[PDB]
Every structure is written in C-alpha cells, then in structure tokens.
Design a binder for this molecule. Structure first.
Ligand SMILES: CC(C)(COP(=O)(O)OP(=O)(O)OC[C@H]1O[C@@H](n2cnc3c(N)ncnc32)[C@H](O)[C@@H]1OP(=O)(O)O)[C@@H](O)C(=O)NCCC(=O)NCCS
Ligand SMILES: CC(C)(COP(=O)(O)OP(=O)(O)OC[C@H]1O[C@@H](n2cnc3c(N)ncnc32)[C@H](O)[C@@H]1OP(=O)(O)O)[C@@H](O)C(=O)NCCC(=O)NCCS
Lengths: 273, 157, 273, 184, 89
C-alpha cells in the first residue's frame, strides 16, 4: 500500500531489458506481440527481439531460421543425443531428458559454433593473410576449429553447408568474414581434401558477419554478443528440437532401461588400496 | 480334435514367457531350414506392458511384439495355431486353463518341470474335452527338422 | 574386421527411428535436408518431421511456429526465468543457466500444456456438459489444469491467447475441443475473474484439434502423442528462447551475485532440537 | 530506513524452518554448529537435523551413514554413472557432469527406494498376510520393488544387504517392517 | 590473515578459504599423494566436489522443508523488477 500510494522507494534488483509482461499487451523487446505477428517476423524475428533487442532485417531473420533448421538433430550417436536417450530410456520425463542431454554442450560437443567464430574473427581483425593464419595455427598446435569433416571432402560437398553458403552469398550485403573463411578453406583443402569448411564453422563465421555487417549493430555490440555466447545459444536452441525428438521417439518405441554391458568397460582398478 | 499335422512349414507360434534366447534359437532354426516366414508371431509376459522385442532373422533384424494380456495376443494375431508355455511349475496350470478355451490354438506345449499330478490330471481332462494337443510336463519340447522347433529342442545351432 | 567381413552378428540397442545421419545426406524423419529446404518447411515443419515423423500440412507448421512465438518469454517474474536470471547472475554459462531455468517447467509452471489436453479430452470423449465438468472438478478438489493464471484476469487479459484463437478459427477445420474449452473458461470466469483460459490450455486443446482433426494421425498416434508428452515439448522449446534471452541480457547488464534479503524470509525454526 | 525505525510492514515469503544463518552462530534445525561438533554426531546427525529437524539417536545416525556408504558407486555400467562419464568425457565440469548424471535417478533407476518403502508400507498398514500380498501383486501383474538380484541368491548373500541386515538386527529396537519384509 | 586483518578487522580467514588451504595441506602433507597428484586433484576440481557434496545435504533439506510447509508457486512481484526496455523496437 505504501508503494501504491508512493512513499517508500525500495531499490529493485533484476534489471531485465526484455519482455515487459505487465500492462495489457505482452510487449517484447520494444515491440508488442500484435506487431510481432502483424509484421510477419518469424521465430528468427522474435529471436532478434528477445536475444539482441533489435529489429533484424528480413533476410537475417530467415537466416536464423535456417541456422536453427540445420543445427537440429544430427544423429543419436553424439554425446548430447546419447544422454537424452539414456535418460528417456530410464523413463524420466521430457525436461530432465532434454536437460541432461543439454549438459554436454560445452567445448568438445557444440563448442565449434563459438570457437570457430572467435578464432576466425580474432585472426581477421588482427590483419592476417589466410596463409599466415593457417601457418600460425600450425606452429602452436591448435587445429583450426570449424574446418574438417570425415567423408564429405570436395566435389562431394556437405549439402547443408551449401544451402547456408548459397543463402549468404545471395542475400547478405558485404560479407567479408565468410570470404576470408573461404580463402582459408581454399588454402587448407590443398593439404587434405576432407578439410572442407564445416557447418559449425560456417554458421559461426556467417553469424559474426551478419552481426557486424547488417544494420543496428555497431561493431562493439556485434562482438559483445559473440563474447557472451549468442552462438552457443543458437546451437543449444537448435539442438533442443533434436533432443526433444529423441526423447519422444525413445518414449514411443517403448525402450527399457540401459545397462551398457561389461564387454565395453575394461575396469583398470588398483591392487589393494 | 487331435490332428495329424501338428507342425508344418507354415506354422506360427505364441510364446508365453520372456524367453528371448529360446525365441532367437527358434528363429535361427527357421532361418537355417530355408523357411520363408518366421515361426513366432508374438510373445506373452504379463508383468509389463506391450512393446516389440527385436530379434535376429539370418543377417537382418526384425521385430516380434510382446503383449501383456493373452486376449490382445489372440485378437491381433489369429494366424497362430500353437502356444508354447514357458511358465513356472506354479503358474503353468492357470496359464493352460486360460489358454485352452481360445479358438485359434490347436496345440499347447507345457515345458515346465514339477507340475502337480492332480493339476495335470485336470489339465489332461480339459485338453481331451477341448480337443487340443498337449505336449506337456517335464519336457524340452519337440523338433520337426525342416519345419519347426519348440523352445530349445536339441540345443544351440 | 569381422563385422566389415560380415560374420559376427551383434544385437544393436538404441532403435531411434529419426535422423539417419550417415550417408551422403542428413536425412531427417524420412526426408533429406535439401528437400526440407526446397519445400520451404520452416522450423515448424522440421518440428513436425523430427517429433511426429509426419510431414505436416502448411496451416499446421505455421501454427507450430505461432506456438513457439507465443510461448517465448513472458517476463522475468515467473519461476523459470527467475532461476535463469539467478544462475546467470551467479556467472555460470548458457547451458547451466538455461537448464536450471528449464528444471522448473513442471506442473505448476508451464507443464499444464499436457494436463489441459488430457483433462479436456478425457471430459469430451466421456461427454459431459461444461457446467458438470466444473462441478466434478471442484467436487474432487482438483484444479482444472490450464484454466488458471496468477496475474492475468478477464479485466486484465493476455493477448497471446487472442492471437492463437484468431488463427485456429480460420485455418483450422472442425475444432470442437477449443469451443468446449472456451465454454469451461467463461463458466469459471462467471464465478472468479482470476481463472482465465491460459495459453497453456489453449495450445493444449488446439494441438489436440490439430492432431486429431488434421490428417496423418489416426486415433492411436494422436493419443499416443498426448500420453507420451509431445505438448510439454512445445512449451519447453518455446520458452528456451526466452530463457536464453534472459541469460544474454543479465550477462550484458553485468549484474552481480544475488543474495535475497533476510527481510523476505521469516525463519520459522524449532525451539531447541 | 522505514523498516529500521519500524513503521512500514512486509509480508515475507519463503518460510524455511531449517538453518538460520543469521546471528553469531550458524544454527541448524534448533542446534548450533558448536553443539553439532561437541555432541559428536556424524553426517547422519546433520542429515537428521537438516532433513528431518529432529536430533536422531546415535544408532539411527550410524544407520544413515551406512546407507550413504552402500548407496555410493555401484559400477559405471549403470545409467546415471554412464551419463556422468559421457559429460566428463565431453569435458564439461564437475557440476554439469554430476548433475546430468543425477537427472536419471527417477523411477527405473534409483526409484526403488521410495517405491519399496511405499509398497511395503501400504501392504502392512492395510494389513495383509505376506502370502496374500505376493499373490495380490502377481494377480495385478506388477513386480515387488524390494526383491530381486539376478546374481546373488539364498545360497550366497549380497554382502551389502547383509551388513545392513546385521546392523538393523543388532541395533534397531522394535523393527516390524523388516521382519515383514523378510517374510515376503 | 594476520597481515590482512590489520587493514579492516573483518577480513578474517573465511571458512570457504580455510577448507581450501587445509584440504590442499592435507593432500600434500599427509601420505599417499606424491606432490604431482596432490596438485592434480586441485586442478581437476576435487575441491568443488567437497562443496557440492556438502551442500547437497542443505539443498535436499530445503526441498523437503518447502514440500513439508505446503508452500505454493512463486511469482516474484513486479515491484522488484524495474524493466528498462528500449523505446520502440
Ligand atoms: C604419410 C601419410 C600417411 C600422411 O597422410 P595425410 O593425409 O597427410 O595425414 P595427416 O594427418 O598427416 O594430414 C594432416 C594435414 O592436414 C592438417 N590439418 C589436419 N586437420 C586440420 C584442421 N582442423 N585444420 C587445419 N589443418 C588441419 C594438418 O595440420 C596437416 O597438415 P600439415 O602437413 O601442414 O601439417 C600419407 O602420405 C601416406 O599414406 N603415405 C603412404 C604412401 C606409400 O608410400 N605407400 C606404399 C607404396 S605402395
Ligand atoms: C497457476 C495457479 C497456481 C494460479 O492460480 P492462483 O491465482 O494462484 O489462485 P489461488 O491458488 O491463489 O486461489 C485458490 C482459489 O482459487 C481456486 N483455483 C485457483 N486456480 C484454479 C484452477 N486452475 N482450477 C480450479 N480452481 C482454481 C482454488 O480452488 C481456490 O478456490 P477457493 O476460492 O474456493 O479457495 C493455479 O491456477 C494453477 O495451478 N493452474 C494450473 C497450472 C497452470 O495452468 N499454469 C499456467 C499459469 S502459471
């Protein structure tokens, strides 16, 4: 009652510059939900509103929908999909299955979305020729992130890196970092043919290029979101569709509890501790 | 009711009991005998809900459903004519009393060992009353080479 | 060498009827990724593919995208976004902050999506009137799931319910369960204004309509996908965008560790144990 | 200032009848931390203080420590330890590895504790004969949580239910449930 | 602690620092660790494990207590928020 009539002045935490839920209309970033649906911006448009708090252009919103379509499920062999399948086979529920699969997206699984953007954008803003970059990441160990595959090499493309590359070269104005990454991949395909530009590297360099080359990002928000982890957010929100698909599918085939047999363990215990 | 051709090359069975090793041995026998179709339609284990166990036909994998109640197993699969009963010595009598009154079953096979004599007397009586062929207690089953194998008759492949 | 030579035969677990990854193309449910991008099915289309393994019609894929745009962020007051902000203020990372927010989507927060479909479709196939369904539900003392909201009312309505209603009236053929749910809503708002048909009930009954009154789901698939939990996944995948937005915002405001002052606690301990 | 001079009012949520952290001593349930360490109660004693808010007797405290010793690791084949190994091998950290292994402890893994407590207590306080209870469960068509173990038998014991059985028979006064459980 | 307690009187050796330095002192002063394992286990994170395993008793205590007090859903009122939205995106 004292705050309602206005004589108390308590300091409020939780600053939250996103999604004013109160009032009469669910206001997003600065734009109401009726304008969100009237202006026909998809889930890429509401990703630009919730995450970046900008009105992204209509090619960039469709590019974010393209990224969340290619970074969906990539087979159940991988670590996160395997953990989701083990929790769904232990009969848990959707949020604990998806959640205990999502706690693998760190550095070795799902880290090439962000490492191959920080690498290609640190070594492009430092003014380094692609041959000098390939040789600099040779004398220091440090395999180049976002470059490599296991089968699809050259004259046998990735066919989902080609869709993103076609979209970016047709729709993005002034894309220098993808062209730098393509010069690096043209240099490193001469070594081995299967050192093609990975999809985890192409989404990284196309995303950094989209942020620092489209409108409304200056250049210091455009790599602040790269440092904070908008690319890790893109991979996690993309792969959540695949992990929920794996939960529903292992729940629908009615699989039982998993045991992982002792033929694949090889205990190496000490003698008598 | 006691027919002559018990098992043929076109027979299909219903297993009673979670006996995946025995069913995979039967499927391996039916692959080795140059037979076109597998001689197991479904399995019954009443302690869990229905699903599909995955079994091996030759080089490839197929699926054999496992039901909870016998009524759905008889309803969904009418092409069977033989029920193998891997139940224990204390739960085979009620299983056979339940399973004889169904229509499509023409022979049963009680593989259990240690049945009561009064229980198998009532079982024999209801079996001759109904007309089914019972290959019952303390057996390993039978084997018709080229056509059919009951459980683990003979041993491994 | 014995497997590639083909003379060993091992029983493989993990049946996974979704997303065949090996081969020259990333096949989804049954449709390759170039066909996915050529038919222009959006993230709703790949949601239909990955989750249901049925290529959905175009008025349903757009409804799934509308659900994932409407069930995005609804402010930081609510308990999941609150836990995400607490963890992002304790400086963790994206997967742990989003995940400690996603482990509150239970039954009281956001997990009414499936119970407001099971209840409203169990009281429609055993057909009663709404005025007796409410009587039965109060008589049993249980809450009508997907009919109550803490902060919204009929004198303070949420607009995201209206955006979905004006889509499911037009592009949806023969949706009777939504009409049943609106009947129950106005029956309960005649008594108390607080109890308003949520988005967590409107999406549940509109998804039951979209599953059982559109094609490709007969009656055992369209009830298996309610019993398994394919409607909680709509809320979890939709709200992941809001929770990642809250992580990015609290990471960009550079906020400190949260402490929750002792004047909001009232310790109520025993005397001397 | 308006509440320090005491004039405003505030309804406070989060009732928390455990561990008052304010004051000059970290008080647990009702007992200070110096009394916890002077009375020589182990971690079973503070499990009784934090979870149950009772100062449990010193045989129940050693039984709680015995339960936390036998419900430790049971090989990495099992599903929770397997998820912890997958997250550690993806190089995450301790709390994401332990946490994504902890989100398997549900009903099929680790739910046998609560299930076998509630089943054997719903078959005892609604008193049935054990021979009628096993027939009731067989007739309904579900297994009894408690009983199992494919390797051990009555021939050779488990030797980690054996030590627990030894402790409850040699320390617990008036244990009917255990006796009833043994009957089954 | 003696040096830094002279600046302000409150800067004492914390419990969250005494457990750390006493644990490192245990690992590298008692037997059975050489000196290359007893600073490996500190780098791996075997001191986060002591905190997480210790604090699990407190978090399970808070779960059981909030279940036993029959507390309802939390909402965190709007007078503790101060939305700072952009003007019109
Ligand atoms: C020697 C031999 C095994 C090497 O084959 P290879 O394909 O080059 O295998 P490697 O692992 O060494 O190739 C790795 C190269 O790709 C680079 N590379 C690998 N991954 C990379 C990544 N993510 N990013 C950037 N560069 C990468 C490596 O740095 C290295 O390049 P470098 O030469 O500049 O160091 C091969 O030449 C061979 O088969 N010899 C036998 C032929 C013969 O004589 N047979 C008998 C006659 S019948
Ligand atoms: C979310 C929820 C806690 C909000 O309700 P609320 O504003 O806090 O209402 P309260 O619990 O404070 O008030 C309780 C009274 O309203 C009744 N009531 C509240 N919500 C009800 C509901 N969904 N259904 C039936 N009765 C309800 C209670 O029975 C009680 O009746 P009474 O006046 O005779 O005592 C509750 O409505 C609910 O659990 N809904 C189902 C879950 C859900 O849909 N969540 C989405 C919105 S968060």
């Amino acid at each position: 009652w004292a705050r309602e009539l206005g004589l108390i002045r308590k300091p409020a935490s939780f600053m939250t510059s996103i999604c004013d839920e109160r009032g009469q209309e669910l206001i997003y970033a600065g734009m109401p939900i009726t304008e969100v649906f009237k202006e026909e911006m998809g889930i890429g448009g509401v990703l630009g509103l919730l995450w970046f708090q900008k009105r992204l252009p209509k090619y960039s919103c469709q590019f974010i929908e393209m990224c969340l379509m290619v970074t969906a499920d990539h087979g159940p062999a991988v670590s996160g999909a395997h953990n989701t399948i083990i929790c769904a086979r232990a009969g848990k529920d959707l949020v604990s299955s998806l959640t205990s699969g999502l706690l693998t997206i760190g550095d070795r699984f799902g880290g090439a979305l962000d490492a191959a953007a920080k690498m290609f954008s640190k070594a492009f803003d430092s003014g380094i020729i692609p041959m000098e970059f390939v040789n600099k990441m040779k004398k220091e160990g440090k395999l180049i992130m976002g470059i490599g595959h296991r089968v699809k090499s050259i004259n046998n493309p990735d066919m989902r890196v080609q869709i993103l590359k076609d979209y970016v070269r047709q729709h993005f104005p002034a894309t220098p970092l993808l062209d730098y990454a393509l010069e690096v991949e043209k240099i490193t395909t001469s070594k081995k043919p299967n050192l093609i530009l990975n999809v985890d590297g192409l989404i990284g360099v196309a995303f950094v290029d989209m942020l620092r080359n489209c409108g409304s990002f200056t250049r210091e928000e455009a790599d602040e979101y790269i440092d904070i982890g908008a690319l890790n957010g893109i991979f996690v929100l993309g792969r959540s569709m695949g992990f929920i698909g794996h939960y529903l599918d292992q729940k629908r085939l009615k699989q039982g509890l998993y045991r992982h047999p002792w033929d694949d363990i090889s205990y190496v215990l000490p003698e008598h501790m | 009711g006691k027919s002559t051709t018990l098992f043929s090359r076109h027979t299909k069975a219903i297993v009673w009991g979670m006996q995946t090793r025995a069913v995979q041995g039967m499927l391996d026998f039916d692959y080795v005998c140059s037979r076109d179709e597998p001689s197991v339609a479904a399995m019954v284990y009443p302690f869990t809900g229905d699903h599909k166990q995955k079994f091996y036909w030759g080089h490839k994998e197929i699926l054999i459903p496992v039901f909870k109640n016998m009524a759905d197993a008889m309803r969904k699969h009418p092409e069977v004519d033989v029920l193998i009963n891997f139940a224990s010595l204390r739960s085979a009598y009620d299983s056979t009393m339940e399973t004889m009154n169904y229509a499509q079953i023409r022979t049963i096979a009680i593989i259990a060992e240690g049945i009561p004599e009064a229980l198998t007397r009532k079982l024999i009586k209801k079996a001759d009353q109904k007309g089914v062929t019972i290959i019952g207690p303390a057996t390993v089953g039978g084997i018709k080479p080229g056509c059919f194998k009951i459980g683990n008759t003979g041993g491994m492949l």
